[model samples]
Target: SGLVPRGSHMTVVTTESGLKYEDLTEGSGAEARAGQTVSVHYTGWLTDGQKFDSSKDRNDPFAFVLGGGMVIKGWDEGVQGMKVGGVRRLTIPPQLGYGARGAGGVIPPNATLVFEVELLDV
Candidate 1:
């Protein structure tokens, strides 16, 4: 039953870059490869279940090119191979996220970030 598990204790798919993800819902459209500009709605949080930011909450979606440094390392790695309309939950370690020095006044240093993303288009 590869129905994609539920809850925080679900098994994760790991990336060499230290980014881990789980697909909540699979997509059927074309896969999102590098160099493609993709649009997504995401909510970011901490392991403690503290929400930090969300594109959906703001009534907007975020756009970025795959493999582009415009986003954090974890995002670049986690979003790879994602298909349009896919929903994924990413568990980003500090190294793949903000790292040593986190976002000032927002994320603490060496903090891990978790994100739930829905790929709208690619």
Candidate 2:
């Protein structure tokens, strides 16, 4: 909704559910809300630094409805309040992630996940 300039600064925040996030680049304009559809480019990795997935590899942005449970618990929580053009890093604990049942074949049981997500549209 405004000029989407990129900047660098981070303030790590931990929620009651144990999910944490820090903004690498803050964006301007309206923050994403629960019913809004948002687009983002993201790369996911395990705590060990092994990459698991990335929307960047496909050259496409991932879109989802905020707070719709269309994604993982961590995403629904961490992705809220993000502004368009902002980049945020998320640290997801097992309880808010896959828990005992990991995803795909890359994530291990009870593994902590790291993600760099760019808010492309809101």
Compare the candidates by lDDT and give the number of the best one.
Answer: 2
**C-alpha TM-score for every candidate:** 0.88, 0.89
Model 1 steric clash pairs: none
Candidate 2 residue 107 Cα shift, in angstroms, is 0.6
Give lDDT tens digits, candidate 2, residues 1-122: 11221213325777778788888889786698888899999999998789999999999999999999999999999999889888989999988888999989889999999999999888
RMSD vs true structure, all candidates? 3.8, 6.8
Query: How well does model 2 score by local distance difference test?
Result: 0.87
**In model 2, what is the error at residue 12, expressed in angstroms?**
1.3
